[PDB]
Amino acid sequence: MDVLYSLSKTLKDARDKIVEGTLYSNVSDLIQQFNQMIITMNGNEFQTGGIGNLPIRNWNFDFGLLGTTLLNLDANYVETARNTIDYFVDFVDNVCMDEMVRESQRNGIAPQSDSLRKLSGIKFKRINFDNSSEYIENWNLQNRRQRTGFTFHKPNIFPYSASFTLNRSQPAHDNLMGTMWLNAGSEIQVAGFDYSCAINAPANIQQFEHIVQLRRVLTTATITLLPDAERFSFPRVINSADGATTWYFNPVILRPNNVEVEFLLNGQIINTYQARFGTIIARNFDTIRLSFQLMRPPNMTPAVAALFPNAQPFEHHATVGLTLRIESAVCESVLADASKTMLANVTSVRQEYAIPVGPVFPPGMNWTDLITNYSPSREDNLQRVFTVASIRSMLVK
């Protein structure tokens, strides 16, 4: 595997530092590494493809080495080189893709393809070099059984979930109390509604709570917390819990009272914030708990008083809400986020080549399904597959 990596940084730092003109002594250390490769390869035969709509192209090796003196590089030197690179590029592409589709229940963390299995061989190890690409960096640290870690802007930790829970309801759905929410990606919006505006509630206050359990722990999270859930601030006609009818939601928004956000880890409160809106830090957590209340306004101008009668019909529905967004965080497990193209690369290669659904990943590499049942096997396969996508993107975008 690590082998693979090199192959690229070799080519990149190659197709990059080898241009008409440059001074040799800038590539001396490089040139070498290169040749070393050609050698180890020559005399070997490979085969990629064979699955779904993936072509089966065959490869052989017989080059040599660059090495003739020259203070500076002459155009001619390049072209005779570029010609050799292009065969390796078109190669690796086919190598990546071939190992980027196969999945294995058992060792979904080990090499699969006939192409790569052959690389992990010892006789090829003589090619490793410069592992600084964030992903491989973490691939190693893990293989040695140590503490990994990645970086994500707007991580994708919440499987899509959009629903409600009626804590008080009746057939007519004319005096409901409960919560409705949308958990998706790195964001949570939740609203608590009480059609009665806590008219008969103790202390004229209705308590609400929303708990979200992450499938993986997030550390170092920078989070935006704002009052109100705009998504649930407008009139809606919603299906009843049993799907038999539809109810009407006509919200009027009040400020959430006694807001308390807790970021817990294994049941323990790691961070807690009381009514603090804006930017907050949650340093290590696997669960978020948002508690907030609707407090009936003790003093009301006529216009307000008119919205909240002592008796039904309740036509304006008191609603309080919160919005929480994880801007950035670190996770020990790979995840999709709003900036990295890994998930999209893997999903795209599989779609383009009509790769059949396998035993590990959900159909279409569906993110929600994947993160909902993020088993160890799916994670090991995802990491292998994400690391390969990152190796590929160093050369082919």
């Binding site: 017989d62 090495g67 003196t69």
Partner: protein, 100 residues
């Protein structure tokens, strides 16, 4: 030639070399060389087969030879140009000095 020359003074295969009896050390060396100049010599030398094909002045099969060679000569000019860039490292000094 191949061993006590080119390969090492040129820095390439410092693995000096090893032939059997079929394809020739002068030729195969090609596939594995990166200095065009050097590289043309190879194919031309390995392919210059005394064009065993002639029927002149009425039945005189006299295995002939390249206009090229003839007096296009360049072959020579190219044999030289390729030589003109074989001047470099690997072993003791009194070596390159003397050789080049």
């Amino acid at each position: 030639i191949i061993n006590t020359i080119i390969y090492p003074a040129f820095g390439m295969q410092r693995m000096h070399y090893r032939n059997g009896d079929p394809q020739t050390p002068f030729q195969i060396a090609e596939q594995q060389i990166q200095n065009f100049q050097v590289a043309n010599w190879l194919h031309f030398v390995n392919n210059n087969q005394f064009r065993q094909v002639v029927i002149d002045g009425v039945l005189n099969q006299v295995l002939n030879d390249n206009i090229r060679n003839g007096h296009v000569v360049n072959q020579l000019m190219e044999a030289l140009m390729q030589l003109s860039r074989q001047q470099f490292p690997t072993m003791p000094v009194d070596y390159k000095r003397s050789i080049q």
